[PDB]
Amino acid sequence: TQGLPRVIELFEARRPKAKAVISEIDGVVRIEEGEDRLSVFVESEGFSKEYKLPKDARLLVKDGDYVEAGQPLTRGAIDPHQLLEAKGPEAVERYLVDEIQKV
Incomplete structure (x- = not known):
């Protein structure tokens, strides 16, 4: 337990x-x-970005x-700033609150 x-x-x-790692864009x-x-x-349509991942860590996406x-x-906690610059502010609020309340 954390x-x-x-x-x-x-x-x-x-x-x-x-x-964990998160997608900066929307794509396959x-x-x-x-x-x-x-x-x-x-x-994606205009963008192709690759993620370097360690062979040991597992992932959520087939x-x-x-x-x-x-x-x-991938599975794990998420860096707040990353998803702030990715999804935006409201999702950050949601994640923070929901995790604190999770604990």
């Missing part, structure tokens, strides 16, 4: 230790792995799936 240090981690908006998910490291490509902006690709 607990009080997590509450502090939230109220201070501090970089999560087990940082194309998973590519030769066996070295894992790469997850969020690709290949070919649609992802909204700021939608977490």
